[PDB]
Design an enzyme around this catalytic site. Structure first.
Site: not given
Ligand SMILES: [Zn+2]
Ligand SMILES: [Zn+2]
Ligand SMILES: [Zn+2]
Lengths: 675, 675, 675
Positions: C150, C307
Site C-alpha cells: 500500500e 485483501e
C-alpha cells in the site's frame, strides 16, 4: 487523624499574600477569622521569588507570612514551590523545558511542565525542598508538606527518550523479552538495539492524542512517564523527611485524571489530597465516585480535599455561579466519602493573569459582605462545631467496584472495536446504580484485598494482570460474587491477547466463552430479554454500545438478546463457582436493568441500602469505632422527605433528634449520628 | 474631496495587466470606457517583477501601464508592491520569513507575511517605495498611494522576540514596572532580566489561537505586533511623502479584523480605505456597522471602498452568485456610510492560481455581454451622473456606540467567564437596534470627543483606559446619557482588575455595584421584568448569555430579573448624574427589549428616526453644507413602500420629485436630496 | 488467467507465521485444508527479520515457510518486505524517514512511510528485491510478486524538495515555461531560479489538507509524489524481472485512494490488485464502482482482490461484525466486477499491536469451530467447485463513466466555488443510477478507447487534457452519446483557465455557453422542470450544490430551472452532433431525475438492463467466449424473487436450472450461466 496537632476538619485553602502587601494581609487575617479559616496553603508558586539565580535564596518574605499566620493560630500547608520553575532557569537551562506531543521544544510559560528527567530540574527542586525543610524544621505550625503542584503532562524530549530506554532495560532485561512483549514482528518492528527505540508521539507511532500503531510501546511510555513524575515527587519527599521526619507529605492529585497511575503514586504518599473541579455536566454521582476513588487509593484512608472553588471556575466553557447552598452541599459530599479537610482554591482572588475570574473566599470588592463569603463563613462555623467527631471515620462497604489506570490506558489506546466504548463511563454506570439505592461501596484497585467484600464488580476488565484471575477465583469460591462484562479478560500486562478463547484467564470462573463481539452504530440498540422473572428483573430492557456473543459452558443463562443475528443467545449469565457466583454482562445495559441487577446481587448477599430516599437524595456512611455517620445530601432544589428509621439518632448539624419521617431542605445536608 | 483633481465617486479597482499582454490591455481600455471605470489600482503584487535581485530594478513595464491609462484619462491608485516579497528574497534572506504561532519557520509562499521586524524587508521595502515616488513625483495621473496590501498576521520569530523586549523597555522602563503590570508573582513568573521574556504562542503561554495563561503578556504582544506592522507602513509613507508630499497615502484595511488596532493605524493614514467581503450569514446591519467603523476611524472623515467583489467570492465555503441589483445595493450602502469611492477586486479575472474563481468586471469569456458587466456598467453611469454631489458629506449622528481593539483583545483572551460572550456580537446587538429604527449613529473610539453626542452606548466596556472614566463622568454630568453593560469597568490598560467593586471607575457614574456575574449554559435564559410600563418597554423580555448580579446604590431600578436565585434583583438601572443619566444593562437582552430601550433613550434626548420604514429597508444620512442626503436601501427581494416625509425632495438616481408615500423596487436604492 | 499454473479463483490471503512458531504452522495447514485455502501472501512485513544491518541477510526462516506450503501444495504470492523499513535503518540512515505536511521530520514508527527519494531506501529496497528474486527464481510455487505494500502518503523532505526541482526541469525545461504554467505573476511569485521553488505544505502554500494559494504548484507536487513512489515500484519490479522475467508483478492498490494516479501506476503493473475496506456507511453501489474502477485501470483486465476482512475491521469508528452470509456476498461482488481472486487480510489474527482486533480466518480461540471460520470454509468449497469456469471473463458494457486523478486533485485543491462539491460523489451519483437499473457499465480513464461504447458519461470533467475534446467529438459524431455537467471544460492540465467561455474545448460538442455558476447554501435547492414529457422524464425534479447558468447555442433545451433569478434558463440540453448526441446537465440532480435520464439515454442507444430486479438486488455480467455469466446478488436482509429470463440457464452455485421467476435468499448470490 491527618495531623494529631490539628483535631478537626481543616478549613482554608491556597493563600498567596506574596501577590499583595502587608496591609491586605491584615485584612486577610481579619476576614479569615470571620470565616472560620484555620489552614493556609502557602508558597505554591514562588520559586522565582525565592531563587533568583542558581546561587541565591531569599526566605525573608516567607518568614514574615509564616510568622503572621502563626500569630493568628492558622496552620500551614507548606508547599515546596516546585510546581513552576523560574524564567531564568528555563532561559539558562533549557533541559528543564518539555518537548511536547507534537514534537516541539517549549519555551518558558505556564506551569506544571518541567521535564521529569531533567538534571537541572531535579538538582534545584531537591535543593529547594531541602532548604525549606531545614529552615523551618522546628516550626510548630507546619502540619503538612505540599510537594510541587498537580503533577502531570507528558514529555518527549531527548532526555526522556534516553531514560525510557533505561526503564525498558530494567523492565525487560533483554531485547528478546522486549521484542516479544511489544510483538515487534508486526510491521517489521524488530529492535536490534535499544537506541533504535523512540518515544511514541506525533512524530512516530501516535496521532490525535489517543491513537497508536503500537499499543505496547504507547502503554509502556505512559507507565514510564507516570513513574518519572513519581520519582520527582519521591525525591522531594525524601529530602523533606531528612529534616522533618514527623511531618506528613502529600501532593495534590486530580481524581480520574487519565495520565497518571495514582494507585502507584499513593503508596508513596503519607496521605492522598486532591483537587475537585467538576464540569457543568458532571453527574453528582460521578464526583462521589471520584472522592471514593481518592479514598480507595490507600484502601480506605481518609484524604484531604486540597482544592475546590468556593464559587465559580475559570476554565469551563460556561462558568456558572454555584447556587446558594451548593458550595456547602458539595463540601459535605467530599467529607461523606472520606475527606478530613475541606480546602479551597483560593482565599483571595488574584488580579491577575488567567485565574482572576476564578472564585475565592475574598474576592475583588475585597470585603466580607458578599454572598460567596457568607456561605463560606457559614460552613466554617459548622466545621468548627463538628470538631474531631468524624475524623478517621471509615467506609465499611460490602460492595466494591474496580478501576485501573493501566487497564484504562490499554483500552483508550486500543483500535478498536468501538470509539463509543468509554471505560470510565461504563465503570460509572455500575457505580451510579449503586449510588441511587444508597448501597455503600468502595472504589478499589484490581490489587485490593477482596475479603472485606461480598460483591466485587469489574466493568470492562480488559487487562488481566498476574495474580488477578487467581485472586478473584479464590474470592468467588469462598462465597463472594464477581461481576464482569463484555471485552474483559482479553489481554495481559503487555496488551498481548490471551489466546484460546475470551475471557481467557476468567473463562473458568465466568463459565462462558465469548466467541466474537459486535459494535453498534450510535443510536442502535439491542434488547435484554429475561428468561423468567428474577428478583427486580422482569421482561425486557435495552442495551447498546457493544454486544458480546457468548456460549454458556457452565453458567446458567438468565437473559438473552432479543434481536439481530445473535437473538436468543446469552447476554446475562450466572456461574456457581465453589460457594460464590459470578455474573457476566455481555452488553452495556440501560439504567433500569442495572438497577435491577444490583438490587438482586445485593439481596443475594444480604446487603441492604443504608436508607431508602427519593431520587436526588444521596446517602453515604462513615464509621468510627462502633459509631455510624450517615450523610444525607439533598441534590434536589426542593425540600425532601424520607424515612430515617426508628432508632435513636441526632443530626450533628442541628443537634436535633431524628426518628421516622424527616424532611431535608433543598440543597440540604444532615449528618445522622447513630450506633 | 479625497483628491481635488478627481471630483466624483471613483469607480474601478485592482487591475493587473502585467498578468496579461498588450493586446488584452486594448480590450481592457475599451471595456473600462463602456463601464464608466475611471480609476485603477496598479502594482499591488509585482515586487519580483520590478526587482530580480538586491541590485536590479525594472520599472519600464509599469511605465507603459501608467502611460496607457493616462491616455485614457484613467486615474492611478499606485501601490508600492510590498504586500508580497520576491522568492529570491525569501531564499537569500530568510529573516524576511515569519515564524508561525506553532513556532515553525515558514518557507516562501502566500503573501502579506513579511516579518515586520526583518532588517531585509525594511531595507528593501523602503528603497522600493522611495524609487517609485521619486520616479513618478511629477506625474499628474497618480491620485493615491496604496501602501503594501492588507497588513496582518503575527510573527513569533527571534527578531520579533528581541524587539519585543525593547518595546517593553520603552513602555515600562523597569522590570519592577513590567513585573507589576503583568502580575508575574502568579505562577512564579517573576522576570529578573528582559531576555527571560518570550513571545506568547503555542510554545509558551498560548494555545488553540485564543487561550492564554498570562493575558497581560498576550495583550502586550498583540500591541507590539500591531505597532511593528504600523511602523512598516509609516516607513513607506514617509519615503513616499519626501517626493510627493501632495499625494495622499493610504493602506487597505479589513473592517472588524481582530488582529490590528486600526484606530491607532488611522492617525497615521491620510485617508482610510477598506476591503468589504461579507460572509453568507453576515447580516446587512453588520456590514453597515463595518463601513460605519471605517468612517469613525478618523472621526467621521469619508473613506475609500478599496475592494469588494463585483460578483462571486472565492474563499467563502459557498460562493453564491450575487443576485441582480445586489452589487449596486451594496455599493450604495458603502457610500451611505461614508465611502467616497467604490472599487472592485478586480477588473479582469486571473487565470490563475487561488483567485481564478473570484469575480471580476471582465471575466473568463473576455467580453462585456455579461450579467455582471451590465450591472457594473449601469452603476458606472450613475456615478458619472452624480458628479461631486455627495463628496465630503458627513454624518451628523447624535447617537454613538463605542468599540475598541484593546478591549477586544483583552476580552477574547480572558478565561472565562463564558465562551458564549462575543465582544463584537454584543456591540452589534446595540448597533442593530439603532439600524432598525434608522437612528443615525456613529461607531466611535473610546478616545473620541463625546461633546457632539446625546447618547453614548459602550457595550461590554471591560477595559477602562486612563482618562476614560473622567471623560464620561463629564459627558453625563453635563447632560449626556451613557449606556454600559455587564462585565464593564473590570480591568485597566494592563488587564489588571480594578479593585474595590465592579464597575470600578464607572461605579460612581453608573450608581450600582456589580457583585457577581453568572454565565448561563447555552439555550438558557433569564427574564427582564419591568417594574412598570416605561415608554416602549412593557412587561417581560428575555435575556441570556451572562447575568450580572447588582446592587442599586445611587441608581433607581427600571427592571428586575424574573427567575433564578437572583430573581427580583436589578437587571436595568437608571442613574441621575449631574444634568445627565446613565443606564446599566446587567444582562444581554433580546432584540425586542433593545428596540424598546433604544427608542426611550433617543426620545429622552430628543433624537428622532431619520425616517420610518418597513423591515429590511435601511436609511442613513450624509450632510453636506446644510443639505441632507437620505440614502434609502431596500434589502428586501420585493417592492417596498414607505412615507418619505412631506418636504419637497428629489431622488438623485431618478431625478423624480418625492413626497409622501413612495415605493422602492426590490434591492432598490434612493438618494433623497433635502435642505 | 492471472497465472496459468493456478486455474481457479485464488483463495487465501496474508499469512504471517513468523509472528508464531513451527507448531502453530502445523495447525495453520490443517485448518487451511478445511477452509479450502490454496494461496498465501507471505513476507509482507519482515524486512527487519531478514536484514539486521546493512550487510546481513537471513532467508532461512522464509525458506522454511515456503517449503512447508509447497508440501501442502499451497501457492505463494511472495512480497518484497519493503512496505516497512527496519528501525536500525531509520536510526542509522534518517534520510529514510519522511518530513510531514506540518514540516516535521518523522521518527521511526508506523509503515508505508519511507521517503521515496531516499538514497538509502532505494539502495536497500532494490538489493532486497533482487536477493529475494535470485534466491527463489526457480521455485515452482511462486505465482505472484507483491511489491512493497500500500504505497501512499506524501513527503516534504529536503531530498524530495531538491528532486521536485529536477522533475520540474524535465517537465517545463525553462523557468519561462514554469512561471507561465504556474501563473506566477500572481502575488509576486516570479521564480528566477529553480532553488527558489519550495514544496507546498503547511510552511508555505497550503493549509488544513486541501487548501492552497497556488493550485499549479500543489497540483504538480502531487504528480511528482505519485511519480516518485511509482519509481520505487518500478525499481523493484525491474529487479524482480531480471531474475524471474515470467512471474507477474503487482502491488496492492486502495481503489479511490485520492493521493496516487492509479491510471499511471497500472500501465506499469502486470496485473492490478487492491484492498477493499468499506466504511459502515459505504453504499453497496460504491464498493461495486471501486471494483469496477480497478478493472478499468487496465481496460477491462481482471484484477486480484488482495485483501478484505473475513469479519470485523479495526480502524473504523464502530467495527461491526459482518452479518451471516455477508462475507460471501461481498466476495462474489468482487468477482462479479472482475476479481479473479478472493484473498483476505488475514489468515490468522495477530496478537499483537494495532491489528489484534482485525478479523482473520483463524482467530484468537485458535480453532475452526467458529461462525467466521464456517463461513470462510463454505466460500472456499464453492470456489474449488467453480474451478476455472469464470476466469478471464470480461465486461461487455456499452455504458462508461470516466474518472480522473488529476481532475480530482485540481477540483479538491480549488477555491472554490463550493466545498459541497465532492467530485467522487458526483461521479457515484451517475454510476449509482446505472447500478440501480442493472445497466452493465465500465469505469474508465479519460484516455480510454471510446469505440466500444454507446453512452459515455463524464461527471464534472473540470480539467480537459490534450486530445480529449477531439476524442469525444469523434465519439459523438460517429453515433455515441456523451454526457458532461456543470463546471466542466474549465481548465487545462496546468489548472489554467481555458478562456473564451465555459466549457471551453467542450463548447462546440455541447452546444452551450455556461456564463456563470451559482453555489447553493447547503439545504438549498432548485428545481428541474421539463419542457415536455420525455421518456421516463416527466414534470419536475429537484437539484442542488451548483447551478450553472447557461445559454443554448446549437443545443435544444429539454429542461429549465424552476426558481431563483435564473428561472427559465436551461438546466438540461441536448446537442445533435453528427450521428450522436451530447447532453449537458447544468446542476446536480436528485436520484429520480438521474434514474429517468439514464433510462432515456440507454433506450436511445438500444442498451437494456441485464435483468429487472427488486431494489438492493444487484446484477452484473462477465462474458467468456460465447457464454455470459450473470452475477445476482441480494443485498437485502430478506428473500427476493425476480424474473431470470426465459432462456435455458443454470445457477453455477446450486447446479439447478433457472427459468422465469426465481427466488434469491437473503444475502444470497446466484451465478447464471447462459448464452
Ligand atoms: Zn523530558
Ligand atoms: Zn518576526
Ligand atoms: Zn522525501
Amino acid at each position: 487523624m491527618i495531623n494529631e496537632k490539628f483535631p478537626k476538619i481543616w478549613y482554608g485553602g491556597d493563600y498567596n499574600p506574596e501577590q499583595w502587601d502587608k496591609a491586605t494581609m491584615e485584612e486577610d487575617m481579619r476576614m479569615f477569622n470571620l470565616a472560620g479559616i484555620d489552614v493556609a496553603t502557602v508558597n505554591v508558586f514562588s520559586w522565582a521569588k525565592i531563587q533568583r539565580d542558581e546561587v541565591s535564596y531569599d526566605f525573608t518574605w516567607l518568614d514574615d507570612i509564616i510568622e503572621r499566620l502563626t500569630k493568628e493560630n492558622i496552620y500551614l500547608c507548606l508547599a515546596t514551590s516546585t510546581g513552576a520553575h523560574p524564567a531564568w532557569m528555563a532561559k539558562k537551562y533549557p533541559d528543564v523545558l518539555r518537548v511536547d506531543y507534537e514534537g516541539r521544544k517549549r519555551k518558558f510559560g505556564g506551569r506544571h511542565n518541567s521535564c521529569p528527567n531533567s538534571p537541572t530540574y531535579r538538582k534545584y527542586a531537591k535543593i529547594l525542598a531541602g532548604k525549606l525543610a531545614e529552615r523551618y524544621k522546628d516550626h510548630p505550625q507546619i502540619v503538612m508538606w505540599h510537594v510541587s503542584n498537580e503533577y502531570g503532562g507528558y514529555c518527549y524530549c531527548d532526555n526522556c527518550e534516553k531514560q525510557f530506554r533505561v526503564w525498558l532495560k530494567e523492565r525487560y532485561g533483554t531485547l528478546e523479552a522486549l521484542n516479544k512483549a511489544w510483538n515487534t514482528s508486526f510491521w517489521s518492528h524488530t529492535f536490534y538495539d535499544w537506541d533504535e527505540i523512540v518515544a511514541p508521539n506525533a512524530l512516530s507511532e501516535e496521532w490525535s492524542g489517543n491513537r497508536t500503531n503500537f499499543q505496547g510501546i504507547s502503554l509502556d511510555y505512559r507507565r514510564f512517564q507516570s513513574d518519572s513524575l513519581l520519582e520527582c515527587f519521591k525525591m522531594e519527599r525524601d529530602e523533606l523527611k531528612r529534616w522533618t521526619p514527623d511531618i506528613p507529605v502529600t501532593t495534590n492529585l486530580m481524581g480520574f485524571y487519565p495520565e497518571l497511575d495514582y494507585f502507584k503514586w499513593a503508596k508513596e504518599m503519607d496521605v492522598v489530597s486532591w483537587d475537585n473541579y467538576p464540569s457543568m455536566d458532571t453527574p453528582f454521582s460521578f464526583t462521589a465516585m471520584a472522592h471514593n476513588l481518592m479514598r480507595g487509593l490507600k484502601s480506605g484512608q481518609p484524604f484531604m480535599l486540597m482544592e475546590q472553588t468556593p464559587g465559580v471556575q475559570n476554565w469551563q466553557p460556561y462558568n456558572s455561579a454555584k447556587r446558594p447552598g451548593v458550595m456547602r452541599l458539595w463540601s459535605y459530599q467530599a467529607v461523606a466519602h472520606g475527606a478530613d479537610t475541606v480546602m479551597f482554591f483560593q482565599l483571595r482572588r488574584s488580579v491577575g493573569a488567567c485565574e482572576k475570574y476564578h472564585g475565592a473566599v475574598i474576592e475583588h470588592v475585597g470585603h466580607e459582605h458578599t454572598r460567596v463569603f457568607r456561605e463560606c463563613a457559614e460552613l466554617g462555623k459548622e466545621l468548627q462545631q463538628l470538631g474531631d467527631t468524624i475524623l478517621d471515620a471509615r467506609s465499611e462497604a460490602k460492595v466494591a467496584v474496580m478501576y485501573d489506570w493501566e487497564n484504562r490506558w490499554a483500552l483508550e489506546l486500543s483500535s478498536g472495536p468501538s470509539i463509543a466504548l468509554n471505560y470510565v463511563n461504563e465503570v460509572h454506570k455500575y457505580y451510579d446504580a449503586l449510588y441511587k439505592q444508597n448501597i455503600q461501596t468502595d472504589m478499589i484497585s484490581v490489587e485490593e484485598d477482596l475479603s472485606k467484600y461480598k460483591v466485587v464488580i469489574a466493568p470492562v476488565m480488559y487487562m488481566v494482570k498476574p495474580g488477578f484471575a487467581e485472586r478473584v477465583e479464590r474470592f468467588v469460591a469462598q462465597g463472594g460474587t464477581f461481576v464482569t462484562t463484555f471485552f474483559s479478560g482479553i489481554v495481559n500486562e503487555n496488551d498481548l491477547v490471551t489466546l484460546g478463547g475470551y475471557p481467557g484467564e476468567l473463562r473458568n470462573v465466568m463459565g462462558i466463552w465469548a466467541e466474537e463481539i459486535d459494535a453498534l452504530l450510535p443510536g442502535h440498540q439491542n434488547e435484554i430479554v429475561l428468561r423468567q422473572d428474577w428478583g427486580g428483573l422482569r421482561g425486557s430492557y435495552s442495551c447498546g454500545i457493544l454486544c458480546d456473543v457468548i456460549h454458556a459452558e457452565t453458567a446458567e443463562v438468565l437473559a438473552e438478546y432479543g434481536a439481530d443475528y445473535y437473538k436468543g443467545t446469552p447476554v446475562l449469565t450466572r456461574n456457581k463457582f465453589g460457594n460464590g457466583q459470578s455474573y457476566y454482562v455481555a452488553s452495556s445495559p440501560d439504567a433500569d436493568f442495572l438497577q435491577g441487577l444490583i438490587a438482586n446481587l445485593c439481596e443475594e448477599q444480604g446487603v441492604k441500602p443504608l436508607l431508602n430516599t427519593p431520587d436526588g437524595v444521596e446517602v453515604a456512611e462513615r464509621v468510627k469505632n462502633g459509631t455510624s455517620y450517615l450523610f444525607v445530601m439533598n441534590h434536589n432544589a426542593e425540600e425532601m422527605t424520607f424515612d430515617a428509621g426508628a432508632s435513636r439518632q441526632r443530626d450533628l448539624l442541628t443537634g436535633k433528634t431524628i426518628s421516622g419521617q424527616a424532611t431535608i431542605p433543598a440543597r440540604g445536608v444532615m449528618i445522622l449520628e447513630r450506633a
